[PDB]
Protein: Mucin-2
Amino acid sequence: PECPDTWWLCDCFMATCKYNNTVEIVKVECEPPPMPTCSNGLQPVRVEDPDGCCWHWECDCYCTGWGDPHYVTFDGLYYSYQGNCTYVLVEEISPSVDNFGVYIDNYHCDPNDKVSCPRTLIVRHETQEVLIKTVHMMPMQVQVQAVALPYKKYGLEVYQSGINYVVDIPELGVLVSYNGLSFSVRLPYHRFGNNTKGQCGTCTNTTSDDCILPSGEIVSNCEAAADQWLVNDPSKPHCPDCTPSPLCQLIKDSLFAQCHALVPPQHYYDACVFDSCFMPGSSLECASLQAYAALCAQQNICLDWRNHTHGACLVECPSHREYQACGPAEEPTCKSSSSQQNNTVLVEGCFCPEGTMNYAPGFDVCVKTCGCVGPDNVPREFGEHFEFDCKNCVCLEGGSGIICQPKRCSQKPVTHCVEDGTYLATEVNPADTCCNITVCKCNTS
Amino acid sequence: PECPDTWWLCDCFMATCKYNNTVEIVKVECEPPPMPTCSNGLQPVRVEDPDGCCWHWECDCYCTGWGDPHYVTFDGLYYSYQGNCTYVLVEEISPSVDNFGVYIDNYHCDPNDKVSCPRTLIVRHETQEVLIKTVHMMPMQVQVQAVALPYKKYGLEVYQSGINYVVDIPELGVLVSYNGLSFSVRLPYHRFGNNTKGQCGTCTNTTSDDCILPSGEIVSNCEAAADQWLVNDPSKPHCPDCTPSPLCQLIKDSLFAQCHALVPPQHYYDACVFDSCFMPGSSLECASLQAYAALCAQQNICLDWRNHTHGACLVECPSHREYQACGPAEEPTCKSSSSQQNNTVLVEGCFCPEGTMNYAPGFDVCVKTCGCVGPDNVPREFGEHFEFDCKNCVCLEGGSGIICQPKRCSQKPVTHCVEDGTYLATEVNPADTCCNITVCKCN
Ligand SMILES: *[C@@H]1O[C@H](CO)[C@@H](O[C@@H]2O[C@H](CO)[C@@H](O[C@@H]3O[C@H](CO[C@H]4O[C@H](CO)[C@@H](O)[C@H](O)[C@@H]4O)[C@@H](O)[C@H](O[C@H]4O[C@H](CO)[C@@H](O)[C@H](O)[C@@H]4O)[C@@H]3O)[C@H](O)[C@H]2NC(C)=O)[C@H](O)[C@H]1NC(C)=O
Ligand SMILES: *[C@@H]1O[C@H](CO)[C@@H](O[C@@H]2O[C@H](CO)[C@@H](O[C@@H]3O[C@H](CO[C@H]4O[C@H](CO)[C@@H](O)[C@H](O)[C@@H]4O)[C@@H](O)[C@H](O[C@H]4O[C@H](CO)[C@@H](O)[C@H](O)[C@@H]4O)[C@@H]3O)[C@H](O)[C@H]2NC(C)=O)[C@H](O)[C@H]1NC(C)=O
Ligand SMILES: *[C@@H]1O[C@H](CO)[C@@H](O)[C@H](O)[C@H]1NC(C)=O
Ligand SMILES: *[C@@H]1O[C@H](CO)[C@@H](O)[C@H](O)[C@H]1NC(C)=O
Ligand SMILES: *[C@@H]1O[C@H](CO)[C@@H](O)[C@H](O)[C@H]1NC(C)=O
Ligand SMILES: *[C@@H]1O[C@H](CO)[C@@H](O)[C@H](O)[C@H]1NC(C)=O
Ligand SMILES: *[C@@H]1O[C@H](CO)[C@@H](O)[C@H](O)[C@H]1NC(C)=O
Ligand SMILES: *[C@@H]1O[C@H](CO)[C@@H](O)[C@H](O)[C@H]1NC(C)=O
Ligand SMILES: *[C@@H]1O[C@H](CO)[C@@H](O)[C@H](O)[C@H]1NC(C)=O
Ligand SMILES: *[C@@H]1O[C@H](CO)[C@@H](O)[C@H](O)[C@H]1NC(C)=O
Ligand SMILES: [Ca+2]
Ligand SMILES: [Ca+2]
Structure:
């Protein structure tokens, strides 16, 4: 009567077993209304229950830090802390993964404040460590050893999305984004809930306990708790009227009208004012604008704000790409055109013009026809015979864009050598530098 | 009481109803015995039912053709047809996929019967046609213009596996493998059941109805009906003693003992005898051994035949590749070593040595460790600086591993010069061919 295996059946049909061939079945179904607040103000995600029929809403853990001193913790709490040693951003209170740590090193690279090194982001996962450190205009990644942009190894991926260098762990769902002036840490609540620590605080959905010391007790003065998260290192062992600029008024302006809802602008406006007061006229005051716009874009609300700032800070990327305030997070590459489960959250950055498109990940030349591109960034077309390197090559469409078979030429000598000191001179041929000639040529002796 | 969907429940449960809660649960589960024998004699594959109740055994439609005249239909009927124009292997009686046809072309790649150029096949799927031709030891493919080996476009893929160049349609399940002396067409039964037509016959699991003329007909001489399928197009529009050598005896030898079961060897032995009789002393008899071994490997009994052929039929590829008779169909390749999961039945063919491995698809350099390889087929190491195409280049792991930056050649100019007739000379730098420093040569 009670079933031989009153028992939860497949497809959520818990059944009350009257008998083996007749039962008293019950449907299971659960619809929760969207979680009202998440305390960070970002929209909740529906995370499914272990039973497929039911589901729930959980808050994403989002930490953001812009400019030099400013940071918002996983639960929205905003605080300004300045320091020099590498400070830990997030770790795991009860270690699940082998090494998981996103660590910031602000000015530890250099005491002076410049794009040479505002800060460097170190994401350490298991055996790997990724060190994104902005050397002037372009950050370069050092992995344990420099690497390229679309890196992928041991479940850790690194890629450039818009103006943000993204280090992600799909198995953990961890997305870390580094910009010149801003850093973001996004963690699933289910995987890292009430299990995180550091300057980004504890993801518990209440702002009250988002300031835990390495010891683990919390404090009210959240700014002081941040210094206690120092990551000790052998180097630097000690590791010890303002005018409201009109630019700062852009936060409260009608441009960000859609942003004033679903995202609180008070913190960013205060950060802008404080940065303007820190020293005027150093173009550091428009870092808060960038992150306010980025968070608005995260809320599926894309804005163009930079042309409104009357200059004084724009993007610095080469001429073959144009700045777009609203664009795909993953630009459409010809080689890798695919589903890509587009988030369609439109990010800002600079992309290839409308007519052309990017060739492939890891490349930067924009092309019209898809073609093939060689180590030198030059568009080739399918079927084009050319002579790259010193070898004749073809650009067929297939597994390898360029066959590049070896050139068919050689040095040309003279056997007769009938003149005083006629010697085979291997002078480089102007048409083919490698295909030179070694003809017999009279020398003085 | 009437169930508000008496119903087939989830996970193939079933029920009838007395109340929606009070239901009369059933369960449907079963395991039919294997299809004992299919006309092809290949092991039938496990084809799932639309629901989750049970499954069944459906044999794959396998058509093989080796040598010049020899064919075996989708149902194990062997025949020998000689032709000079392009012919249709398999089409659809009722067209369900647009322009889907596999067409053979004999005596047009070259009129040649030996491995250098036996024939060409043209696989047409929708907007695409793949023309695999083989010129001497190297088969080349033309797609609509030539293409590379790991070609992929519009759901149609071409690669090479072992000695066989594979054109497949994963959506349709169609597989087509050309080696110079053989081809094989594999079609799933459910997708192409009694809908096929051509020289490969109808896939009905019965040999009897295999032979049809273009117009629906049943003629018992499959050989004679093969001529009727001729596809004519603007190309070539005018288109219309024997010593029993031991080499063929190798089929019946104890080497193929595992093959004599699960695979009938009568057809291949007769084909070898006939090929020897057509003209002896030309090694056209090693095509039947090759395909017998290929079929055995399909059925898991992989054997080496070439070694005991006493030097008659051997494979060829450059020195960096060694012949391993039972090796992976998908080569372990460093780029995309993702534990590529494929049928673990090992194919014959030549691979990189056990110490090294193939670098990436479309490449041929057997890298030891891993690295980048340039357009020039030179192995590179991670974090290595070289000078290629007159640009400083670094091989570093990531995307587009070779990152090459322009020369940046700082020629320092020798210009104030004193000697008889010393003129400023921007001669090409001996140290760097790319640099042409001013060195100020005299007369
Ligand atoms: C962590 O958890 C989640 C996010 O993960 C968040 O909590 C959920 O939402 C609220 C937080 O505000 C929790 O508490 C409830 O708040 C309601 C507020 O409603 C007021 O405002 C609306 C505006 O329209 C008015 O209409 C309304 O009249 C109120 O003025 C309260 O109304 C709720 O009270 C009811 O529910 C509780 C709990 O069942 C009952 O005890 C009450 O008697 C009454 O029926 C309630 O106080 C809510 O509980 C959380 N939901 C879930 C599913 O957990 C938070 O960010 C965070 N921390 C908290 C506080 O949980
Ligand atoms: C397509 O693929 C199918 C499945 O593999 C094959 O069709 C069957 O496969 C058998 C196996 O060879 C074929 O041969 C004969 O099967 C008879 C089955 O009869 C029993 O099973 C059926 C139900 O399936 C019952 O109704 C019946 O009462 C029996 O219990 C056998 O009886 C035959 O035996 C005779 O021939 C063999 C040699 O082949 C002798 O050794 C025996 O002594 C006896 O004389 C025989 O085995 C047959 O075509 C199909 N039968 C089945 C099992 O369904 C086809 O081979 C394949 N291609 C074709 C042509 O359809
Ligand atoms: C889990 O989170 C709650 C707050 O939501 C906290 O009070 C509790 O101590 C946490 N426990 C763990 C497992 O850390
Ligand atoms: C210039 O500014 C306007 C808003 O005032 C904006 O709509 C436009 O896209 C900007 N163009 C640029 C970026 O030059
Ligand atoms: C993303 O957009 C592309 C077109 O740009 C489309 O082909 C692809 O299917 C989309 N993927 C998803 C699921 O967003
Ligand atoms: C300059 O260098 C190129 C490349 O090596 C060579 O072909 C050419 O002859 C040299 N001379 C000049 C000045 O053109
Ligand atoms: C050209 O000169 C090089 C040396 O720079 C020599 O190795 C080569 O054999 C010569 N012949 C060719 C290829 O023209
Ligand atoms: C296939 O065979 C079935 C009978 O099993 C028949 O009804 C159907 O019409 C046949 N289809 C073709 C086109 O051969
Ligand atoms: C190699 O050849 C000899 C003669 O063919 C034979 O005895 C031996 O079994 C062969 N070994 C294999 C299978 O490689
Ligand atoms: C394809 O099959 C081979 C044969 O064992 C097996 O190694 C693996 O499944 C595939 N090869 C690789 C490593 O890609
Ligand atoms: Ca918290
Ligand atoms: Ca048939």
